[PDB]
């Protein structure tokens, strides 16, 4: 009931460039009164799952830090963005913790991220030697070695670049179309509350 300066949710949900899945562009939503009713006026969403909290009771809760990471993911891979899920884009690109307290918002972007010849600017990691820890990020493009012969930094017959493209085309059926995902998180570990509701 004392809204002063709403958080820039329109700078997170309504943006022209969304990063790849191995990048996050995490934004610290802080030092501003958060009105969680503005998220419903940006676009028609296709997935809205709040793990731990309630979408209606989000307005009357205080937190120490709210984060908002965004990335473009395939349609068949939205089901992997969930606490305790295994998969290609859930073990090597984005691992949500099993104690996740937040919301995962996903919506289609076929009219903005699909050119007739396919857009190869959205890259995804296929495999690593290990699995990512919760909330970890890898931008290293070290060439993979699928064989017994060492690879001296050149993509060859057995040496592979770790990042592959999606190739989003408008003719692909629903499932291979771009889906922009904005995962909201909340922290209350040890800090004063600075991100409250309209109050």
């Amino acid at each position, epitope marked *: 009931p004392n809204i002063t300066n709403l958080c820039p949710f329109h700078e997170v949900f309504n943006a022209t460039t969304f990063a790849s899945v191995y990048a996050w562009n995490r934004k610290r939503i802080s030092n501003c009164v958060a009105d969680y009713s503005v998220i419903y006026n940006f676009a028609p969403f296709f997935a809205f799952k709040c793990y731990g909290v*309630s*979408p209606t009771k989000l307005n009357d809760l205080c937190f120490t830090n709210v984060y908002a990471d965004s990335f473009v993911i395939r349609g068949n891979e939205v089901s992997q963005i969930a606490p305790g899920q295994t998969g290609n884009i859930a073990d090597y690109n984005y691992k949500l913790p099993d104690d996740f307290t937040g919301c995962v918002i996903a919506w289609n972007s076929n009219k903005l991220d699909s050119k007739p010849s396919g857009n190869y600017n959205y890259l995804y990691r296929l495999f690593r030697k290990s699995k990512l820890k919760p909330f970890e990020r890898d931008i290293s493009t070290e060439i993979y070695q699928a064989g017994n012969k060492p690879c001296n930094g050149v993509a060859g017959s057995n040496c592979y670049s770790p990042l592959q493209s999606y190739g989003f085309r408008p003719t692909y*059926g629903v499932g291979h179309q771009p889906y922009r995902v904005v995962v909201l998180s909340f922290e209350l570990l040890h800090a004063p509350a600075t991100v409250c509701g309209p109050k």
Partner: single-chain antibody, 235 residues
């Protein structure tokens, strides 16, 4: 279970409201879908995502989801708005729960065809197939909604476009098996050990989303229905 007034009424020209309450597991966490079924026809989707309507539904129908309850506002009802309106939500217990039906009584292309029915010798089995033509079958999900004669809608099974996930109701779990064939454009439902309480029409409902309603909990809705196959399992 979604509680709903069993019968509402109104005069032609006034706006009536049909409420539908629910727990924090179905409406509070997911979206509400309102349907309309004239006497002797198949249901049609009115409002999805609690505030959105397809092209066919006029603007007179309004929706609103305030907390864990929903409301269907029919502004200026005509003589043709005399039917039973149902609510729909996806409970987090992996089941599609319907309402009870509200008999609104006034005081004044894509084709889904299904076959396979008859007496089932209550303890036998029966095969149900649903033909499909003209909506990119591999992209939309499929459903199975049966309705006893004179009763409400009951959800049976669901299968996503990929076919990986498949959910069943608690009363048809372990006895029914759903499947799809993307090459033949057909939806199958194998019924085994049919009991005396499985007499219904078994509509074949085509969903508008791709994934199951658990992952896409803000887009699901049964757009195109079909003419059900009245099974008559009896002695």
């Amino acid at each position: 279970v979604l509680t709903q007034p069993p019968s509402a009424s109104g005069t032609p020209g006034q706006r009536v409201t049909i409420s539908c309450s629910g727990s924090s597991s179905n409406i509070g966490s997911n979206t509400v879908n309102w349907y309309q079924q004239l006497p002797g026809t198949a249901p049609k989707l009115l409002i999805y995502s609690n505030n959105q309507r397809p092209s066919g539904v006029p603007d007179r129908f309004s929706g609103s989801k305030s907390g864990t309850s929903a409301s269907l506002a029919i502004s200026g009802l005509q003589s043709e708005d005399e039917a039973d309106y149902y609510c729909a939500a996806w409970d987090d217990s992996l089941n599609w729960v319907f309402g009870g039906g509200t008999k609104l009584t006034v005081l004044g292309e894509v084709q889904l065809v299904e076959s396979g029915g008859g007496v089932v010798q209550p303890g036998g089995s029966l095969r149900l197939s649903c033909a499909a033509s003209g909506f990119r079958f591999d992209d939309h999900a499929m459903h199975w909604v049966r309705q006893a004669p004179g009763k409400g809608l009951e959800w049976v099974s669901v299968i996503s476009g990929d076919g990986g996930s498949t959910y069943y109701a608690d009363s048809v779990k372990g006895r029914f098996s759903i499947s799809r064939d993307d090459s033949k454009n057909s939806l199958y439902l194998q019924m085994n050990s049919l009991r005396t309480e499985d007499t219904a029409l078994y509509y074949c409902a085509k969903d508008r989303s791709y994934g199951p309603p658990d992952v896409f909990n803000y887009e699901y809705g049964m757009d195109v229905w079909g003419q059900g196959t009245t099974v008559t399992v009896s002695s």
